[PDB]
């Protein structure tokens, strides 16, 4: 259960190349990979690449080619050749030593996160107030705006209104003193 | 804080979509967490049911305790059953104009 650390490799990884990962993992100090790698048996002779996959040694091996940032550190160890048995990565991708599993935990962490947001949502709307017998039937822009009973008929006044800028020309304003 | 919460939700959705798109482009024992999650979901469902029952028995218990002045099915009928029936121009029902026998002016 040691994928949760968000540690990094800085100087215990003088390099994170294909074999340089095995030699970095030889010297776990402090965070670069597991102290329980083949660190010690890889460092008995020298900073090397045998304990990666060639000899039977559980080091942070070149599980695949990655020179640019860091090879995908897999604690590669199998008594026959051509296999790495995975639990994590000492690579510098995402700047951390994550779990190196599939999209499963990635999306599931995405969704646990969004669900944090969602429960926030549900409660936030929850107890604002409720509709009741009357919507929130409790405690027993609306009053007025323009005109309630403002009937036409004599609206005819309108009709004449349509005479007046005409009986006489509106003067220009353009002055908001 | 309506606009603040709206912007927060929008930023969260944008971050989620960005993380999903980035992941898509890059791809190209005794824990019982599920049991605790199911227990929390059942507790939330029971709380929602209790809140619904409370809102029902609290906002609709007006006429159940004592008949008081309430337009909702308790006051509008008293005048209606006494004067007119259901009619709607916009919200107008049963004007008193004696038009049943008036024949003078509407």
């Amino acid at each position: 259960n040691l994928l949760g650390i968000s540690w990094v490799d800085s100087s215990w990884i003088p390099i994170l190349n294909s074999g340089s990962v095995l030699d970095y993992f030889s010297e776990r100090s402090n965070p670069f990979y597991d102290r329980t790698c083949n660190n010690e048996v890889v460092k008995m002779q020298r900073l090397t690449l045998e304990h990666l996959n060639q000899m039977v040694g559980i080091e942070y091996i070149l599980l695949h080619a990655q020179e640019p940032i860091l090879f995908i550190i897999r604690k590669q160890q199998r008594q026959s050749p051509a296999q790495v048995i995975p639990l994590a990565d000492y690579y510098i991708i995402a700047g951390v030593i994550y779990q190196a599993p599939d999209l499963g935990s990635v999306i599931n962490s995405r969704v646990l996160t969004a669900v944090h947001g969602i429960q926030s949502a549900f409660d936030e709307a929850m107890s604002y107030c409720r509709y009741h017998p009357s919507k929130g039937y409790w405690w027993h822009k609306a009053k007025r705006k323009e005109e309630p009973s403002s009937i036409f008929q004599r609206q005819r006044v309108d009709a004449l209104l349509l005479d007046l800028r005409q009986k006489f020309p509106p003067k220009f304003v353009q002055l908001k003193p | 804080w309506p606009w603040d919460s709206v912007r927060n939700n929008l930023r969260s959705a944008l971050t989620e979509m960005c993380v999903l798109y980035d992941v898509l482009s890059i791809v190209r024992n005794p824990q019982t967490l599920q049991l605790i999650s199911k227990k929390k979901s059942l507790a939330g469902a029971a709380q929602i049911l209790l809140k619904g029952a409370e809102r029902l028995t609290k906002s609709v218990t007006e006429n159940q305790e004592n008949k008081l002045q309430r337009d909702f099915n308790s006051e509008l009928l008293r005048l209606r059953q006494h004067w007119k029936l259901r009619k709607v121009g916009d919200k107008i029902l049963g004007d008193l104009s004696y038009r049943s026998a008036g024949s003078l002016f509407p």
Binding site: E146, S149, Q155, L161, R165, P170, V173, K176 | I92
Partner: peptide, 24 residues
Amino acid sequence: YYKFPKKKDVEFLPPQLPSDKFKD
């Protein structure tokens, strides 16, 4: 209102009234 009151344009008539409540 204060603001700037620069509502010039033209029109200056219309009606701005309401009483539609008699089956019409």
